[PDB]
């Protein structure tokens, strides 16, 4: 099926499961709570969608019109977060479905945002830098006129087809025309480079999130006793399909904390090496010339890598990579969805039948929105994280060590020297920066979300069907937020 | 593991080498002087130049290993013909070398040469060379031109009466053609008069074993009844009287089988007509085309008033099928009102009486006073009422309950014998499997199925029914079951077969010269029927393209009757 | 060959080439040179063009003539994947295999590699 119906059926399943317990769990009158279930049907449709049409001067004096869209799914939390895509395949249905997904995406990881998505029907390869500049300026102005750009209203973010370069234009075109009198004008858009108020560690956000999500589930005895793992350090092998940003970052971190990468695939032919693949060497080889073809110490594996023997699978590629035909022929034990819906619902029942754990995509790749939330907070605070506290903490730690040293010397007469910290602690002290705080916050958020998802799945007597657990958790949170006001 | 490749131009090279050896004048190993004529030639080349010379003088006998070889009946004409054939590399007859070759071949004791001369004379037979053609036919009388000569004599019996070719023409072939009823004729009025004139002289119209060699009752008696009524008394009139009662016995056609009602020919195949097709093609099958083995394709023809029955039952009881109602709810229920029975023995079809209960997709055996059905069921649901289907008599009567509760089960007479493997309580898989034979109408004891597998694809393996593996949701995935269980009482040993990719649930059973063919199937993964037909032979261990039916239907009844003239002519 | 049998000789040569072991490498080139068959040389050239990648790792590339390898590489018919592999093969042909696993002297065979056909970043 398509994407719209696929994401629409999940909400129906979640609401049908929730309603039975939610009728009595929230009751505080004539047993009319069943008629109160219109709240659920309020959540389904998108509140607002807008379509644009604006002219451009062009570099040759010609005139053209460009169509753009923006949708806002939920308004239960005032600031809305979404991406901007530059492609000719954009449509109103796609953007509204993506906004609907983004609302639950933010709700799962306790990010107080709404949900939005934008798309401009344009091919970036057909225009030079000046045309893209004009497109971005005019689009931002048109969005600002109707009220879809405000820092307290709607906050865009980069998509796969756009970079920080466009967001730099958006920020200063909003901060000098409409939001000139706004003190928080620069907080309208997240994802901008450092010099205009970006955040550190934004590049490796999604890989860190994927790795933390995998780790939080690979260290649970109850869940991995169902299949049998002895997990965490058993040198479990994994294969990565798709060598984009998220795949590369997650693979490096997994290798760094004790994992073996056996095979790496892409749109073109793949490779295979049972001895393991060094992430740095492979990254340098790819950066050197195009794809990873002809990598030394890598046999050119033939056949479906999705069916290759492994323990962890990372399908970070286009949609519906795993289907009904492919489902029974795979040998992996854990599926970690790194992209937007790698698997089809028809193949999900197949995995559930043979007790194959599938970590939902709604939870795994929330690092991108978590760091965006952190960047928005930084822009609101007008100060980088940890600037006013690093020296204070260093002095406090040194005082603690000196105090324990003196107190220990007092009893034992010779002079002991416990004041010296370890090499790792010394390196951490010397090179403290914002990236450490960002990574700490991301890890904490992922761990808490994983614990909440596990407890919800346990409470509603679900097995390894974590997708439904995550959707139920998000729907319950949204209902709880939206009920206590109206 | 050596192989041998032979070129197609090696004959020319061999001929060139033989010519070079002959023209060299050397390498002579056999010297023969006959009639005072001395020549030099190669023995191998001389043997290869002619046809009967190699088999006569190079047969490895005592005379073939002697300095002098004795030849009797060989004239100079034969040697000249052999030399001309060797030089020109041509073997044909003309207007000046026809009678001489036939005359010289009589004393040569060469049957192949005589047959070739007779065939050439037949291919160049005119009114001015009737005597030469007759002499050539009498000299050889080849077994391949005998039928053509007999047909020519019969078609021109008026001229053959005074012609000498009638005495030299074959007599057995003409008699067989006269008694034959399947011969191609555009009419049965002038043709009958011509046959009568050819068989007997006009004076007769106006002991001998050959007279009784004609099987009048075996041939089409419908057109010859009038001639036989005016003819002398014969014991062949009982068949006509017996067949008269068969016209009003359409319902009891299988029961009215007679010793003279045997199935003509063995042209049994699969016809892409009948049944209800829901998946994977949404097209109703209506073209009743019969595949022609000579042509290799089911050419379209005028299927006027063709029997169009939907979801009809399939059974093989002495080439006669009897069924009541029809149900295909597993692959999509489709109500139908047309019922047809395949009776190739009688070469006729009729609308049988519809029974009260639509019970089908079972095993029907021609035993007792009527066909018996094992229990019964509705179209798609089990019912508390148990009755026996009697479409022939249209009598709805209560019957005793069956030993095993089976509703809409699958069963067929494999190799002319009724057999049942495992079972299924309709569309829902059960845990208890019992094998009840419809032929015996009782729960006969059999080996219990260790694995709850059913509705599998069955083919003809080791001349017995065999079910290996299966495809269902009971195994938790779309895999192949390693355990194969087959019950072969006659064979006494298990028949190993490849797993069936497509399950066969209540499908039509057809036997075509001991070659099982499967059309359609059950595909749980796709959620519909099978869009392709595949045959997986265990011995072959490979997939081969078999006869592809026009419509990918499941459980489509096969009808055998009189084919259209255009379809028969291909 | 003395019997003027093209088909049998060609089939035998093809079977030997398809069943040629690594330990009998010296028994193929010498046999082709001595026999001077009209089909064995073509089969050997095709095998070289198809297994140059494998021969580069082994010592067979060093044993092969440098001029013949350069001539084969110059023709636009060899099967190659990336310019780096072509450069490595040229270096292995123009230098010792053990040394690679010397760019001081620019060999003439190095010019056979199409510089514009390489990747811009690699170039």
The DSSP secondary structure of A267-313, one letter per residue, reads SS--EE-TT---HHHHHHHHHHSSS-TT-TT-B---S-GGGSS-SEE
Longest Cα–Cα distance of chain A, Å, equals: 90
Nearest to A295 by CA among A266, A260, A271: A271
Bridge partners (DSSP) of residue A117 are A71, A83
What number of C-beta contacts closer than 8 Å exist between A and B?
10
**HSE, side-chain direction, 13 A CA sphere, residue A111:** 32
Resolution of the determined structure in angstroms stands at 3.1
Asked if the C-beta of C85 comes within 8 angstroms of chain A's C-beta atoms, the answer is: yes
DSSP annotation of B476: S
| Min Cα–Cα distance to chain C from B269, Å | 45
Please report residues of A whose CB lies closer than 8 A to that of C81.
293-294
| Min Cα–Cα distance to chain A from B475, Å | 10
CB A315 within 8 A of CB A344: no
- Cα A413 versus chain centre, distance: 57
Helix axes A367-381, A434-459, angle to 10 degrees: 130
Please report residues of C whose CB lies closer than 8 A to that of A288.
119, 121-122
CA of B524: which chain A residue's CA is closest?
A324
Please confirm whether the linkage preceding A384 is cis (ω < 30° from 0): no
Say how far apart CA A117 and CA A81 lie, in whole Å: 8
Q: Under DSSP, is residue A83 helix (H, G, I), strand (E, B) or coil?
A: strand
Q: State whether A294 and C121 contact (CB < 8 Å).
A: no
Sign of the dihedral defined by the CA atoms of residues A424, A426, A431, A432, in that order:
positive
Q: State whether A294 and C119 contact (CB < 8 Å).
A: no
Q: State whether B477 and A324 contact (CB < 8 Å).
A: no
Rounded to a whole number of angstroms, the distance between the first and last alpha carbons of chain A is: 36
Q: State whether C119 and A293 contact (CB < 8 Å).
A: no
Nearest to A192 by CA among A335, A368, A372: A372
Does the annotation list A186 as a binding residue?
A: yes
- The encoded tokens of residue B241 equal 């009287």
CA of C7: which chain B residue's CA is closest?
B5
Please report residues of C whose CB lies closer than 8 A to that of B7.
7
β-pairing verdict for B464-467 and B522-523: unpaired
CA of C81: which chain A residue's CA is closest?
A294
Asked if the C-beta of C119 comes within 8 angstroms of chain A's C-beta atoms, the answer is: yes
Nearest to B391 by CA among B507, B252, B245: B252
Please report residues of B whose CB lies closer than 8 A to that of A344.
none
Q: Kindly give the residue spans of alpha helices, DSSP state H, lying in A303-366.
A: 345-353, 361-364
What is the per-residue burial (b if ≥16 Cβ within 10 Å, else e) of C91-108?
bbbbbebeeeeeeeeebe
Nearest to A263 by CA among A327, A310, A303: A310
Q: State whether A354 and B479 contact (CB < 8 Å).
A: no
Q: State whether B476 and A353 contact (CB < 8 Å).
A: yes
Q: Kindly give the residue spans of alpha helices, DSSP state H, lying in A289-430.
A: 345-353, 361-364, 367-381, 390-411, 423-430
Q: What is the number of other CB atoms lying within 10 angstroms of the CB of residue A56?
A: 17
| Min Cα–Cα distance to chain C from B1, Å | 12
Among B472, B475, B477, pick the best mutation site for testing chain A contact (most A Cβ within 10 A): B477
CA of A292: which chain C residue's CA is closest?
C82
Say how far apart CA A290 and CA A92 lie, in whole Å: 35
Asked if the C-beta of B6 comes within 8 angstroms of chain C's C-beta atoms, the answer is: no
Chain C residues 59-78 with CB within 8 Å of chain A: none
Say how far apart CA A333 and CA A328 lie, in whole Å: 12
Say how far apart CA B509 and CA C57 lie, in whole Å: 62
Q: State whether B476 and A354 contact (CB < 8 Å).
A: yes
Neighbours of chain B (3+ CB pairs under 8 A): A, C
CA distances from A421 to A406, A431, B121 (A): 15, 14, 120
CB burial class (10 A; 0-12, 13-18, 19+) of residue C21?
Answer: exposed
Say how far apart CA B546 and CA B296 lie, in whole Å: 12
Write out B425-437 in H/E/C secondary structure: ECCECCCCCCCCE
- The encoded tokens of residue B374 equal 């094992």
Does the annotation list A41 as a binding residue?
A: no
Does the annotation list A459 as a binding residue?
A: no
Q: How was this structure determined?
A: cryo-EM
Say how far apart CA A108 and CA A209 lie, in whole Å: 14
β-pairing verdict for A260-265 and A116-121: unpaired
Does the annotation list A378 as a binding residue?
A: yes
CB A73 within 8 A of CB A96: yes
Neighbours of chain C (3+ CB pairs under 8 A): A, B
Please report residues of A whose CB lies closer than 8 A to that of C119.
288-290
Q: State whether B477 and A350 contact (CB < 8 Å).
A: yes
Q: State whether A354 and B525 contact (CB < 8 Å).
A: no
| Min Cα–Cα distance to chain C from B13, Å | 14
Please report residues of C whose CB lies closer than 8 A to that of A296.
none
Q: State whether C84 and A289 contact (CB < 8 Å).
A: yes
| Min Cα–Cα distance to chain B from C48, Å | 27
Say how far apart CA A25 and CA A19 lie, in whole Å: 10
Kindly report each contact of residues A306-311 with a partner whose C-beta sits within 8 Å and lies 24 or more positions away, as own/partner.
Answer: A306/A241, A306/A330, A307/A331, A308/A239, A308/A262, A308/A263, A308/A272, A310/A237, A310/A238, A310/A239, A310/A262, A310/A263, A311/A236, A311/A237, A311/A238
Q: Under DSSP, is residue C66 helix (H, G, I), strand (E, B) or coil?
A: helix
Sign of the dihedral defined by the CA atoms of residues B366, B371, B375, B378, in that order:
positive
Residues of C with a Cβ under 8 Å from any B Cβ are 7, 11
CB C28 within 8 A of CB C35: no
Q: How many helices (H) and strands (E) does chain C have?
A: 7, 0
| Min Cα–Cα distance to chain B from C55, Å | 30
**DSSP code per residue over A111-170:** -----EEEEEE--GGGS-HHHHHHHHHHHHHHHHHHTSS-TTTEE--B-TT--HHHHHHH
Bridge partners (DSSP) of residue A52 are A68
Please report residues of C whose CB lies closer than 8 A to that of B5.
7, 11
Closest CB from A324, A325, A328 relative to B479: A328
Say how far apart CA B291 and CA B298 lie, in whole Å: 4
Say how far apart CA A4 and CA A385 lie, in whole Å: 39
CB A299 within 8 A of CB A273: yes
Nearest to A98 by CA among A124, A128, A118, A123: A118
Q: Under DSSP, is residue B160 helix (H, G, I), strand (E, B) or coil?
A: helix
Q: State whether A293 and C84 contact (CB < 8 Å).
A: no
Does the annotation list A192 as a binding residue?
A: no
**DSSP code per residue over B228-282:** HHHS---TTHHHHHHHHHGGG-STTTTTT--TT-PPPS------S-SS---SS--
Q: State whether C122 and A293 contact (CB < 8 Å).
A: no
Say how far apart CA B448 and CA B457 lie, in whole Å: 19
Chain B residues 479-498 with CB within 8 Å of chain A: 479
- The encoded tokens of residue C52 equal 């140059």
What number of C-beta contacts closer than 8 Å exist between B and C?
3
Nearest to A81 by CA among A97, A96, A103: A103
Please report residues of B whose CB lies closer than 8 A to that of A353.
476-477
Does the annotation list A110 as a binding residue?
A: yes
Q: Kindly give the residue spans of alpha helices, DSSP state H, lying in B347-430.
A: none
CB A311 within 8 A of CB A238: yes
Say how far apart CA B475 and CA A354 lie, in whole Å: 10
- Cα A163 versus chain centre, distance: 16
Say how far apart CA B570 and CA B564 lie, in whole Å: 10
Q: What is the number of other CB atoms lying within 10 angstroms of the CB of residue A401?
A: 15
Does the annotation list A354 as a binding residue?
A: no
Say how far apart CA B315 and CA B313 lie, in whole Å: 7
Nearest to A124 by CA among A159, A81, A77: A159
CB B537 within 8 A of CB B530: no
Q: What is the number of other CB atoms lying within 10 angstroms of the CB of residue B388?
A: 22
Query: Is residue B20 within a helix (H) or strand (E), and if so which, with residue range?
Result: helix B10-24
Helix axes B237-245, B221-230, angle to 10 degrees: 130
| Min Cα–Cα distance to chain B from C3, Å | 15
Please report residues of B whose CB lies closer than 8 A to that of C11.
5
Nearest to B501 by CA among B528, B520, B474: B520
- The encoded tokens of residue A387 equal 């600037």
Q: What is the number of other CB atoms lying within 10 angstroms of the CB of residue A19?
A: 15
Does the annotation list A253 as a binding residue?
A: yes
CA distances from B468 to A202, B455, B456, B520, B538 (A): 58, 11, 8, 18, 10
Bridge partners (DSSP) of residue A315 are A241
Say how far apart CA B498 and CA A363 lie, in whole Å: 45
Asked if the C-beta of B5 comes within 8 angstroms of chain C's C-beta atoms, the answer is: yes
Say how far apart CA A247 and CA C121 lie, in whole Å: 23
Question: What positions of A carry a catalytic annotation?
Answer: 117
- The encoded tokens of residue C114 equal 């199409």
Please report residues of B whose CB lies closer than 8 A to that of C7.
5, 7
CB burial class (10 A; 0-12, 13-18, 19+) of residue B22?
Answer: middle
Asked if the C-beta of A294 comes within 8 angstroms of chain C's C-beta atoms, the answer is: yes
CB A201 within 8 A of CB A439: yes
């Amino acid at each position: 099926p398509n994407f719209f119906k696929m994401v629409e059926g999940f909400f129906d399943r979640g609401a049908s499961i929730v309603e039975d317990k939610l009728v009595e769990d929230l009751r505080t009158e004539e047993q009319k709570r069943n008629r109160v279930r219109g709240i659920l049907r309020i959540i389904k449709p998108c509140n607002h969608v807008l379509s644009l049409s604006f002219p451009i001067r062009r570099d040759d004096g010609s005139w053209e019109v460009i169509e753009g869209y923006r949708a806002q799914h939920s308004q239960h939390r005032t600031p809305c977060k979404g991406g901007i895509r530059y492609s000719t395949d954009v449509s109103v249905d796609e953007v509204k479905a993506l906004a609907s997904l983004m609302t639950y995406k933010c709700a799962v990881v306790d990010v107080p945002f709404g949900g939005a998505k934008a798309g401009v029907k344009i091919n970036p390869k057909n225009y030079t830098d000046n045309e893209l500049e004009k497109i971005t300026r005019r689009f931002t102005m048109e969005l600002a006129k109707k009220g879809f750009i405000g820092p307290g209203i709607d906050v865009p973010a980069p998509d796969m087809s756009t970079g920080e370069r466009e967001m730099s234009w958006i920020a200063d075109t909003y901060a000098s025309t409409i939001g000139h009198y706004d003190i928080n004008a620069h907080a309208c858009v997240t994802g901008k480079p450092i010099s205009q108020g970006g955040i550190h560690g934004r590049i490796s956000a999604t890989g860190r999130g994927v790795f933390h999500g995998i780790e939080n589930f690979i260290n649970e005895a109850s869940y991995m006793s169902i299949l049998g793992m002895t997990p965490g350090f058993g040198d479990k092998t994994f294969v990565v399909q798709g060598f984009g940003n998220v795949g590369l970052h997650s693979m490096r971190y997994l290798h760094r904390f004790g994992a073996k990468c056996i095979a790496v695939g892409e749109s073109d032919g793949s490779i295979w090496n049972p001895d393991g693949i060094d992430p740095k060497e492979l990254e340098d080889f790819k950066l050197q010339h195009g794809s990873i073809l002809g990598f030394p110490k890598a046999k050119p594996y033939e056949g479906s890598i999705l069916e290759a023997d492994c323990d962890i699978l990372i399908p970070a590629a286009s949609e519906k990579q795993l289907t009904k035909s492919n489902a029974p022929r795979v040998k992996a034990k854990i599926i970690a969805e790194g992209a937007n819906g790698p698997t089809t619902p028809e193949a999900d029942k197949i995995f559930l039948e043979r007790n194959i754990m599938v970590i939902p995509d709604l939870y795994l790749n929330a690092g991108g929105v978590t760091v965006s939330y952190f960047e928005w907070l930084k822009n609101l605070n007008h100060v980088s994280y940890g600037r006013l506290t690093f020296k204070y903490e260093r002095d406090s730690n040194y005082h603690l060590l000196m105090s324990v040293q003196e107190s220990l010397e007092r009893k034992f007469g010779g002079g002991t020297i416990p004041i010296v910290p370890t090499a790792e602690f010394q390196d951490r002290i010397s090179g403290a920066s914002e990236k450490d705080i960002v990574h700490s916050g991301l890890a904490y958020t992922m761990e808490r979300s994983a614990r909440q998802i596990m407890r919800t799945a346990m409470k509603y007597n679900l097995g390894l069907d974590l997708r439904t657990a995550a959707y139920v958790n998000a729907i319950e949170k949204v209902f709880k937020v939206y009920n206590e006001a109206g | 593991v050596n192989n041998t490749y032979r070129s197609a131009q090696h004959s020319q090279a061999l001929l060139r080498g033989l010519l070079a050896l002959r023209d060299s004048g050397i390498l002579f190993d056999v010297v023969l002087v006959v009639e005072g004529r001395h020549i030099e030639a190669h023995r191998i080349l001389l043997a290869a130049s002619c046809d009967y010379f190699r088999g006569m003088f190079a047969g490895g006998l005592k005379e073939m290993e002697q300095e002098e070889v004795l030849i009797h009946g060989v004239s100079y004409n034969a040697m000249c013909q052999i030399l001309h054939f060797i030089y020109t590399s041509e073997l044909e007859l003309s207007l000046s070398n026809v009678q001489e070759t036939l005359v010289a071949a009589c004393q040569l004791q060469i049957p192949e040469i005589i047959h070739f001369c007779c065939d050439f004379l037949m291919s160049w037979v005119d009114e001015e060379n009737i005597l030469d053609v007759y002499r050539l036919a009498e000299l050889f009388d080849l077994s391949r031109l005998t039928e053509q000569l007999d047909t020519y004599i019969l078609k021109n019996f008026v001229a053959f009466s005074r012609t000498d070719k009638y005495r030299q023409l074959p007599l057995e072939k003409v008699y067989s053609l006269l008694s034959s009823n399947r011969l191609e004729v555009s009419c049965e009025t002038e043709v009958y008069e011509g046959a009568l004139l050819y068989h007997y002289s006009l004076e007769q119209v106006q002991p001998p074993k050959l007279l009784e060699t004609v099987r009048f009752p075996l041939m089409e008696a419908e057109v010859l009844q009038r001639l036989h009524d005016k003819l002398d008394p014969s014991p062949l009139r009982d068949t006509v009287a017996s067949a008269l009662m068969y016209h009003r016995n359409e319902s009891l056609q299988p029961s009215l089988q007679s010793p003279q009602t045997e199935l003509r020919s063995d042209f049994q195949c699969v016809v892409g007509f009948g049944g209800i097709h829901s998946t994977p093609s949404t097209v109703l099958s209506d073209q009743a085309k019969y595949l022609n083995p000579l042509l290799g394709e089911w050419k379209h023809f005028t299927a006027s008033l063709a029997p169009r029955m939907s979801n009809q039952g399939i059974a093989v009881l002495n080439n006669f099928v009897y069924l009541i109602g029809g149900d295909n709810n597993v692959q999509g229920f489709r109500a139908e009102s047309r019922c047809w029975r395949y009776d190739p023995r009688h070469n006729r079809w009729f609308q049988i009486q519809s029974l009260q209960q639509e019970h089908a997709d079972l095993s029907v055996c021609v035993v007792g006073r009527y066909i018996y059905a094992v229990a019964g069921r509705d179209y798609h649901n089990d019912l508390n009422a148990v009755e026996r289907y009697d479409p022939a008599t249209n009598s709805w009567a209560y019957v005793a309950p069956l030993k095993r509760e089976v509703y809409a089960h699958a069963g067929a007479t494999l190799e002319g014998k009724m057999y049942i493997t495992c079972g299924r309580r309709g569309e829902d898989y059960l845990k208890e499997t019992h094998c009840y034979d419809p032929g015996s109408n009782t729960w006969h004891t059999l080996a219990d199925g260790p694995v709850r597998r059913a509705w599998h694809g069955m083919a003809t393996l080791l001349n017995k029914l065999y079910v290996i593996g299966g495809s269902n949701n009971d195994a938790g995935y779309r895999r192949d079951v390693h355990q194969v269980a087959c019950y072969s009482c006659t064979s006494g040993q298990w028949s190993s077969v490849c797993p069936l990719p497509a399950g066969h649930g209540e499908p039509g059973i057809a036997v075509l010269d001991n070659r099982i063919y499967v059309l359609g199937g059950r595909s749980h993964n796709r959620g519909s029927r099978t869009g392709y037909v595949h045959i997986y032979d265990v011995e072959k261990d490979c997939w081969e393209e078999g006869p592809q039916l026009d419509n990918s239907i499941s459980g489509l009844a096969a009808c055998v009757l009189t084919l259209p003239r255009s379809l028969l002519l291909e | 060959c003395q019997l003027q049998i093209p088909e049998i000789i060609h089939f035998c040569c093809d079977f030997l080439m398809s069943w040629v072991d690594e330990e009998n490498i010296l028994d193929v080139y010498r046999l082709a040179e001595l026999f001077d068959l009209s089909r064995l040389t073509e089969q050997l050239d095709t095998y070289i063009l198809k297994n140059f990648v494998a021969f580069s790792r082994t010592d067979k590339y060093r044993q092969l003539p440098l001029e013949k390898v350069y001539s084969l590489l110059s023709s636009n018919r060899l099967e190659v994947s990336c310019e780096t592999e072509v450069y490595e093969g040229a270096l292995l042909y123009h230098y010792s295999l053990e040394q690679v696993q010397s760019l001081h002297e620019p060999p003439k065979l190095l010019e056979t590699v199409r510089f514009p056909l390489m990747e811009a970043e690699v170039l």
